[PDB]
Amino acid sequence: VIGTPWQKLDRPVSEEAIEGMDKYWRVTNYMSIGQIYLRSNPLMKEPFTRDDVKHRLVGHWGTTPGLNFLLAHINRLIADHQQNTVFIMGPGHGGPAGTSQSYVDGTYTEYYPNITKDEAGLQKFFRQFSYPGGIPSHFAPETPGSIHEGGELGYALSHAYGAVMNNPSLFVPCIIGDGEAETGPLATGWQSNKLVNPRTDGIVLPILHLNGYKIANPTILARISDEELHDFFRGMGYHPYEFVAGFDNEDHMSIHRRFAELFETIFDEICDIKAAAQTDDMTRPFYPMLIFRTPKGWTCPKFIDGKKTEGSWRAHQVPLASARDTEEHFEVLKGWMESYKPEELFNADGSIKDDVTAFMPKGELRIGANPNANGGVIREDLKLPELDQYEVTGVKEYGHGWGQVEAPRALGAYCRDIIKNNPDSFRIFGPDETASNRLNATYEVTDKQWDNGYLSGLVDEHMAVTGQVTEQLSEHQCEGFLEAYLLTGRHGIWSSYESFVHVIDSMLNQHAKWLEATVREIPWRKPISSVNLLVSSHVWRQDHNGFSHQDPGVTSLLINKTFNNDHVTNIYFATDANMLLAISEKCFKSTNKINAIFAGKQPAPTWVTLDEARAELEAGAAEWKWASNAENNDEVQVVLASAGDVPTQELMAASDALNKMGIKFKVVNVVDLLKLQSRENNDEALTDEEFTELFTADKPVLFAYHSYAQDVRGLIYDRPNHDNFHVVGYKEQGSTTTPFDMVRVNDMDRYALQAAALKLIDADKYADKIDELNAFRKKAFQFAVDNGYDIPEFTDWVYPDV
C-alpha cells in the first residue's frame, strides 16, 4: 500500500506549506526560463550577458507557469495527505515544468547523477533542455514522473482513467490543455467516469488548464459563457469547481492560500466519494473536476515590443526570441528572471534551499519516484494457464484442414482463464466488439464493467458495476485505457474490426515511439507489458458491412516502426486457432512491444496442431511438408506461400488442384511477417540461408498476402530470389457479397491462385487452363448472383488430408 489513501486533513493548510509552495512556484518558473534561454551562468552571476543566452531559443513558456503552479499544489497535497499520486501533463510541451519538478523532488539527480544539486549541475540542467546531445522539449519517457509525453494532444484523459483502473489507492490529477480539449479523443475522454467504479478503481481529477489560448487562437472552452462551461461538465457527470487567478493585482501568497483551500475542499469531496463507495459501489458519484483559469504565460512580461504577451497566445512558444541578439530583449529577460528573486531560492553553492522543499513529499510518494509512474517496477508475470488444454485437437485426430472452428474463441477461453488466475491485473477492452470478435467466453468469469444506469435483466447481461472487460464505442478510449493500464504495470488485450484499427494509427505511432526511446536509452524505466491487439472481423469476411470495412492496412503503418533493431513492433498472422494460441502466449509473455495479432473470426479450417504452431511461430515462416509434393527444392515448380487465414485456405485449395494436375510445388506458411526482412534490417529475421531454404534459390514464388502486396514487396527487397515473388494482396475491391466473390475480385480466390501459379510456371503451355479457371470464377459469381449463395464446389471443399 503506498501512503494512507483518501485521508482528509481536518486542519487548515499551514502557513509554512503556503510559503514553500510559493518558493516552489518561483524556483520552477525560474528554472523553466533557465532551461529555455540559458547556455551558461544559471544564477546570473556577474557578468551576466547575452553571451549566456542560447543561440537557438526553442521550447514552450506559455503553459509552463500554470503547470508549475499546479505542481506546487499537487506536491503539497501529496505530502499532507500521504496520497499515492501520478499526474498527467496533457500539455506535454510544458516539459520544463516536468523536468523542474523532478529536479526539485530529487529524483532527477538520483536518475542522472551528473545533473547534481548545485551550481555546476544547474548549469548543465539549463543547457541540456531541447539541446543537441541533451534532453527532449516535452515530458518524455526519460523524465521521472512521466507516463504520458503529451506531444500529440488528446489522450490525457484515457491515460488518466486507464491508470486508475483496478488501482483503488491511486489519485490522478489530469492536467488538460484547453486547446487539447478541442480534439476528438479528449472530448470523448471526459465520459470515462461512466466506466470506472469508485470502490475498485482509483480516482481521476480532471483539471482543465483553461489559460484562454492555444498556439495562435483563443480556445472554445475559454470563450463560451461560464454557465455553458459549468453545464457541460455537470452534464458529463462531474461536479465543476472553478478557480480564477492572475488577472488582477491579487498578491501571490493570497492566490496560494485560496487555491489550497479550494483544493482541500475538492479532495475532501474525493475522500467522501471514496468512503461512501465502500458501502454503495453502485451509485455513480459526480466526481469533482477543476476549471483552472489563469493567464497564459502567467508572470512573464505583460507586453513585449508593444504586444500583449502574458494572457495571450503570443506566450505560447518563446517570448523575447531576440534575447541573445539585442540588448533590449536581453534586459527584459534579465528583469524577468530577477522577478523570481533567485537569491532567496538558492544557497551560494547553487543548491535549492531547504525551505523551498521542506513541504515536499518524500520517498516513493514523490511524483518522480512513484512506481506507478514506472510500472515495470511493479509489473509481475501473468500466471498463465497451460496452453495445451485449449488446442484444437481436430487436426491430430482427423487431419490438416479439419473443421469449422471460429479461431478467436480459443483465445476467448484462454483469456477467460487468464482473468480467473489474474483477477485484477488483466483487462479486456473492446469498442462494442468483444462479443462480435468472439472473445465473449471471458464473460464466464467476469462482466463488462458499466457504472451508469441499468434497466432490466432482459437487456443487461454480463455487465456489472465492477468487472475486467471495458467497452465504449471509441478506439481512442480502448487504446488509451490499455496503454496506461500497461504503463502502470498491468496486462491485457483489446480487439478491433481491422479496418477501424486505423482510427488509432497515430496512437500506435506514439506508443511505439515511447517504446523506441525506452529500449534505446532509458534503462531505469523497466519493461512494461505489451499492447496486444486482436485485429479481427477482417477485410475478407465483412458480410454485413462492405467496402468501408475493408482496409487491412494497419500492417503498413506498423512496418514504419521496425528500425534500429528496437524490436518494439510485431505483426502476426494467426493461420488458425492453434497458431492464434501460440502467438497469444508469446504476446502475453512479451514486454515492451506492440503486437498486432491478425485472426479471422469466421468459421474456418484448422491447419496445424498446437505443437506445430509453437515450432512454426518461432521460425516465423515454415514449410508445410505434409502439403508440399516436391522432393526437394530443385524439383519445385512454384513456391505456394501465404500469410492470413483466408489467403491460406485459398492457397491450400489451389495446392490440391495443382497436385491433381501433376504440378510440383512446396507450401510455405508465413506467421511472423517481419522475419521476412533481411538480417541487415532485422537481426532477428530468418538468415539468407533459411530464407533460401524456404523460398528456393530461384523457383517462382506465388505469395498470397492478407493485406496490401506493397508491404511484402518493400520488406523483401534485398532478399535472395525476391525478383521471383509474385505477391497477390488486397486491392480495394469488394462490397457486401458472398465469401467467394470477395476473394474473386481481388484475384485471391483458389482458382485465380491456381491460374497465377500456372502463369508463373509456363504461361504458353497453360493458356487454356488459365482461361478455363478464369471462366470458372465468372460462373461461380453468376451462380452467387442467381442463387443467393456460393457454388457448392467452392463451399463444400475440404483439404484431402481430413
Ligand X SMILES: CC1=C(CCOP(=O)(O)OP(=O)(O)O)S/C(=C(/O)CO)N1Cc1cnc(C)nc1N
Q: Which residues line the annotated binding site?
A: 63, 93, 151, 153, 178-180, 211, 213, 296, 316, 500
Judged by CB under 8 A, the chain residues 506 through 525 that form the site for a second copy are 506, 509-510, 513, 516-517
- Residue ranges binding ligand X (CB under 6 A): 62-63, 91, 93, 151-154, 177-180, 183, 209, 211, 213-215, 219, 296, 316, 431-432, 473, 497, 500, 503, 545, 549
* 8 Å CB contact between 299 and 339: yes
> By rule CB under 5 A, what string of x and - marks binding of each residue 672-711 to Na ion?
----------------------------------------
Task: Please report how close the Cβ of residue 472 comes to a second copy at its closest, in angstroms.
Answer: 5
Task: Please report how close the Cβ of residue 49 comes to ligand X at its closest, in angstroms.
Answer: 30
| Pick from 138, 136, 146, 140: nearest CA to 88 | 146
Residue 566 binding result from ligand X, Na ion, a second copy, none, given CB thresholds of 5 to 8 Å by partner type: a second copy
- CA 393 to each of CA 31, 67, 598, 606, 757: distance values in angstroms, whole numbers, following the listed order: 65, 58, 21, 9, 32
What's the grid cell of residue 382? 501473468
Judged by CB under 8 A, the chain residues 19 through 58 that form the site for a second copy are 39, 54-56, 58
* 8 Å CB contact between 319 and 487: no
Q: Does 792 bind a second copy (CB under 8 A)?
A: no
Rounded Cα gap, residues 587 and 509, in angstroms = 19
User: Among residues 114, 326, 787, 795, which is the contact residue for a second copy, using CB under 8 A?
Assistant: 787
324: how many CB neighbours lie within 10 A of its CB? 20
Residue 34 binding result from Na ion, ligand X, a second copy, none, given CB thresholds of 5 to 8 Å by partner type: none
Q: Does 718 bind Na ion (CB under 5 A)?
A: no
271: how many CB neighbours lie within 10 A of its CB? 18
Rg from Cα positions in the chain:
30
For the CA atoms of 289, 295, 299, 302, what is the dihedral angle to 10 degrees?
A: 180
Judged by CB under 8 A, the chain residues 106 through 145 that form the site for a second copy are 130-138, 140
| Pick from 499, 457, 501: nearest CA to 475 | 501
> By rule CB under 5 A, what string of x and - marks binding of each residue 148-187 to Mg ion?
-----------------------------xxx--------
* DSSP states of 584-633: HHHHHH-BS-EEEEE---SEEEE-S-HHHHHHHHHHSEEE-TTT---SSS
Q: Is the CA virtual torsion 384, 387, 388, 392 positive or negative?
A: positive
Residue ranges of the annotated binding site for thiamine diphosphate are 63, 93, 151, 153, 179-180, 211, 296, 316, 500
> By rule CB under 5 A, what string of x and - marks binding of each residue 605-644 to Mg ion?
----------------------------------------
Q: Does 184 bind a second copy (CB under 8 A)?
A: yes
What's the grid cell of residue 790? 456460393
* 8 Å CB contact between 218 and 182: no
* SS3 category, 283: coil
Judged by CB under 8 A, the chain residues 689 through 708 that form the site for a second copy are 708
What's the grid cell of residue 556? 503498413
Phi, psi torsion values for 445, nearest 5 degrees: -120, -10
Q: Is the CA virtual torsion 357, 361, 363, 364 positive or negative?
A: negative
Instruction: Please say which residue, 550 or 642, places its beta carbon nearer to a second copy.
Output: 550
* 8 Å CB contact between 721 and 698: yes
Instruction: Please say which residue, 505 or 688, places its beta carbon nearer to Na ion.
Output: 688
User: Among residues 211, 440, 642, 669, which is the contact residue for Mg ion, using CB under 5 A?
Assistant: 211
What's the grid cell of residue 677? 526482412
Q: Which residue is nearest to Na ion (CB)?
A: 723
Instruction: Please say which residue, 63 or 754, places its beta carbon nearer to ligand X.
Output: 63
Residue 723 binding result from ligand X, Mg ion, Na ion, none, given CB thresholds of 5 to 8 Å by partner type: Na ion
Residue ranges of the annotated binding site for Mg(2+) are 178, 211, 213
Question: To 5 degrees, how large is the angle CA 784–CA 789–CA 793?
Answer: 85
Question: What are the strands, taking DSSP E only, across 498-581?
Answer: 531-536, 569-573
Task: Please report how close the Cβ of residue 725 comes to Na ion at its closest, in angstroms.
Answer: 9
Q: Does 723 bind Na ion (CB under 5 A)?
A: yes
Residue 332 binding result from a second copy, ligand X, Na ion, none, given CB thresholds of 5 to 8 Å by partner type: none
Instruction: Please say which residue, 470 or 628, places its beta carbon nearer to a second copy.
Output: 470
Which burial class, exposed, middle or buried, applies to 66 when counting CB atoms under 10 A from its CB (0-12, 13-18, 19+)?
buried
Residue 473 binding result from Mg ion, ligand X, Na ion, none, given CB thresholds of 5 to 8 Å by partner type: ligand X
Q: Which residues contact 398 (CB under 8 A, 6 or more apart)?
A: 802
Residue 288 binding result from a second copy, Na ion, Mg ion, none, given CB thresholds of 5 to 8 Å by partner type: none
User: Among residues 290, 737, 752, 753, which is the contact residue for a second copy, using CB under 8 A?
Assistant: 737
Task: Please report how close the Cβ of residue 211 comes to Mg ion at its closest, in angstroms.
Answer: 4
Instruction: Please say which residue, 392 or 515, places its beta carbon nearer to a second copy.
Output: 515
Q: Which residues contact 518 (CB under 8 A, 6 or more apart)?
A: 141, 525, 592
The residue ranges that bind Na ion (CB under 5 A) are: 723
Chain residues binding Mg ion by CB under 5 A are 177-179, 211
